[PDB]
Amino acid sequence: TTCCPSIVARSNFNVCRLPGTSEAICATYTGCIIIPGATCPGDYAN
């Protein structure tokens, strides 16, 4: 599951994914995170 720190970060994550970039690279690029669960924490609410 991906969790993002702000709207901006999510928007740029989604663009990063368009060519098929791995989630892990899009995570470090944006500040979004990948977690094994489905419940994003309050500081990664977007």
UniProtKB/Swiss-Prot annotation:
Domain of life where this protein originates: Eukaryota
Keywords tagged on the record: Disulfide bond, Plant defense, Secreted
Which compartment or compartments is the protein found in? Secreted
Gene Ontology BP annotations: defense response
Q: Which Pfam families match?
A: Thionin
Disulfide connectivity?
C3-C40, C4-C32, C16-C26
Q: Which GO terms describe its cellular component?
A: extracellular region
Task: Spell out the InterPro entries in the cross-references.
Answer: Thionin, Thionin-like_sf
**Where does it primarily localize?**
secreted
What more does the entry say? Two isoforms exists, a major form PL (shown here) and a minor form SI.
- Entry similarity comment: Belongs to the plant thionin (TC 1.C.44) family.
Protein name per the record: Crambin
Q: Per UniProt, what is the name of the gene that codes for the protein in this document?
A: THI2
